[PDB]
Design an enzyme around this catalytic site. Structure first.
Site, PDB file in Angstrom:
ATOM      1  N   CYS B 129       0.894  -1.122  -0.035  1.00 33.54           N
ATOM      2  CA  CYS B 129      -0.078   0.138   0.163  1.00 33.54           C
ATOM      3  C   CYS B 129       0.777   1.151  -0.012  1.00 33.54           C
ATOM      4  O   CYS B 129       1.412   1.730   1.061  1.00 33.54           O
ATOM      5  CB  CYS B 129      -0.921   0.125   1.061  1.00 33.54           C
ATOM      6  SG  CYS B 129      -1.941   1.305   1.386  1.00 33.54           S
ATOM      7  N   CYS B 132      -0.588   3.922   2.326  1.00 36.12           N
ATOM      8  CA  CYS B 132      -0.068   3.836   3.649  1.00 36.12           C
ATOM      9  C   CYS B 132       1.249   3.929   4.006  1.00 36.12           C
ATOM     10  O   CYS B 132       1.438   4.819   5.138  1.00 36.12           O
ATOM     11  CB  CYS B 132      -0.616   2.191   4.020  1.00 36.12           C
ATOM     12  SG  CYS B 132      -2.304   1.622   3.390  1.00 36.12           S
ATOM     13  N   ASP B 133       2.087   3.684   3.300  1.00 38.44           N
ATOM     14  CA  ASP B 133       3.687   3.400   3.761  1.00 38.44           C
ATOM     15  C   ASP B 133       4.438   4.566   3.002  1.00 38.44           C
ATOM     16  O   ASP B 133       5.875   4.436   3.296  1.00 38.44           O
ATOM     17  CB  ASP B 133       3.985   2.105   3.658  1.00 38.44           C
ATOM     18  CG  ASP B 133       3.359   0.993   4.698  1.00 38.44           C
ATOM     19  OD1 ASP B 133       2.790   1.628   5.703  1.00 38.44           O
ATOM     20  OD2 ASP B 133       3.284   0.075   4.236  1.00 38.44           O
TER      21      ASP B 133
END
Lengths: 314, 314
Positions: B129, B132-133
């Protein structure tokens, strides 16, 4: 001279702070101009906070989150915008700002009675949000004040929780939609809802328990009437905070019209580069979690717009 | 005999647990059948949790929240449904269930390489992701593996954060949309993205720092190539968890088609009484906060549907 930012988010709140967190973690360095959740005393439906949460506490956490990843917060009030030119112009009391993309997350404002008894018991049994506070009064008696769609929907919602709902209105007819009226009159026939026409709230009654009753006064003579209730819900109406956009964006009943749909760009307005998130564009759900979700959507919409604009400049 | 519930929510996850909290606080007593966020180690974009949050910790909190207000949780796997009759039938390994309204929140499944080096470093520099990261790798070098829309969009997202992005694919052409391809080739011309065709990941390399490199092997000869990167993003693809609904609901590329729009009933599917929330219906945003928002929407949609159905029975 005007302070330019690639992206400006207008409004603090679940939608605005959510857009800030996502835009900042996308490396956009957003500016948020700060100037319904911050009046709720106990917040029991923010998923993942099962007990102890308050409105102000959640806003402090969201604010800290936006700032952690580099949002520039600005405390100013915007009295005028120009969306006819790019970069868009925001005129504040303290400064002028311009931006290449704008996310509007200015929320909506609930209208109240304006009564000291109402303010006295605000948070101790007086509420403006049935979805937020209704569960408190399971198997108990409640009252809803108002006459439009909002009042009718709140009385319907509460009629599956409360033992009895009393809907109070100052006129003798409802200004709400016909399907909603039919549902209401069905529940009245079964004894779940009572309707008191031509009356207004004169005083909110209670003690250390909080609310215990409401005194109504008729709007057609001098008579008065006491109702015993534990929860009073004020549902006179909601007004989206959109006056400065009138004549510059497509509005429907004051809400900002967004594209929506399932193929992206769901927060796009009628002006390219301008996105709208939260209760300023949502007349149906109007919760903090749904606003936070749309603010995340507006951040991604704005990210894709700015990147494509960037590709063709200099 | 089948266990009947007025409302069943299928799937644990942000969308399912959010719908449970709202349906339970509406006094519906929902049943949730439990059987992408629970694999993310550090969750940094759940608005209002500025530091310290993990995927499992957030799921535990959401689960506790749904249970606090009276959700019945059931641990079973559903291998078949019948949506052609009402109440709808769910056939599980342990029991059969029926319901008057159904909320489908079964999520989606990201596909991985299936490499021990990939699993070894999962969470220590290997991710599925970018949203997300990605912020972790600001001004650093990253790699994206895959060849469809997802891989291209992730490389584009990361190209505003990372110092350099290397996109790796096993074929020598992309199966992604033409607008996305044009953006990608623009960034390649400016030196921000490199594309390595006809290669696959052979081993993920690193130590106590986490990831430090990736060894690629060509799919057309015997040659190999080491790339130094700090973050590896696997973007082979997403598959909505919808196989048991094929032939019974309108799907588009495996996603459940929902009404959407700005006038309510936004989570309604092609079958009356069946609603869909989260990544099972959202191909664009795919975040926990946007899923939580749609689960809240599905709860209100289901509430209005059940109430109207109730009005005309017995």
């Amino acid at each position: 001279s005007a302070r330019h930012s690639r992206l400006i988010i207008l409004g603090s709140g679940p939608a605005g702070y959510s857009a800030a967190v996502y835009a900042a973690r996308a490396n956009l360095k957003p500016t948020l101009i700060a100037g319904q959740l911050t009046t709720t005393t106990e917040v029991d439906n923010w998923p993942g906070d099962p007990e102890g949460l308050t409105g102000p506490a959640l806003m402090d956490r969201m604010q800290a989150h936006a700032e952690r990843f580099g949002t520039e917060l600005v405390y100013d009030h915007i009295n005028e915008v120009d969306l006819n030119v790019r970069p868009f112009v925001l005129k504040g009391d303290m400064d002028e700002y311009t931006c290449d993309a704008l996310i509007i997350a200015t929320g909506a404002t609930a209208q109240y009675l304006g009564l000291e008894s109402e303010q006295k018991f605000m948070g101790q049994g007086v509420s403006a949000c049935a979805t937020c506070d209704g569960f408190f009064y399971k198997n108990q008696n409640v009252m809803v004040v108002g006459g439009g769609n909002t009042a009718v929907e709140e009385a319907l919602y509460l009629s599956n929780i409360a033992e009895h709902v009393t809907l109070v209105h100052r006129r003798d007819s409802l200004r709400s939609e016909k399907i909603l009226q039919d549902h209401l009159f069905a529940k009245e026939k079964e004894g779940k809802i009572s309707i008191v026409w031509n009356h207004e709230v004169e005083e909110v009654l209670g003690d250390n328990t909080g609310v215990t009753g409401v005194r109504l006064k008729s709007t057609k003579d001098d008579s008065k009437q006491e109702v015993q209730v534990q929860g009073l819900f004020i549902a006179i109406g909601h007004k989206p905070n959109t006056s400065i956009f009138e004549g510059q964006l497509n509005l429907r009943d004051g809400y900002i019209q967004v594209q929506s749909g399932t193929s992206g760009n769901a927060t796009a307005t009628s002006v390219a580069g301008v996105f709208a998130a939260g209760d300023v564009a949502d007349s149906i759900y109007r919760q903090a979690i749904t606003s936070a979700g749309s603010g995340c959507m507006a951040a991604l919409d704005a990210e894709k717009y700015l990147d494509n604009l960037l590709e063709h400049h200099h």
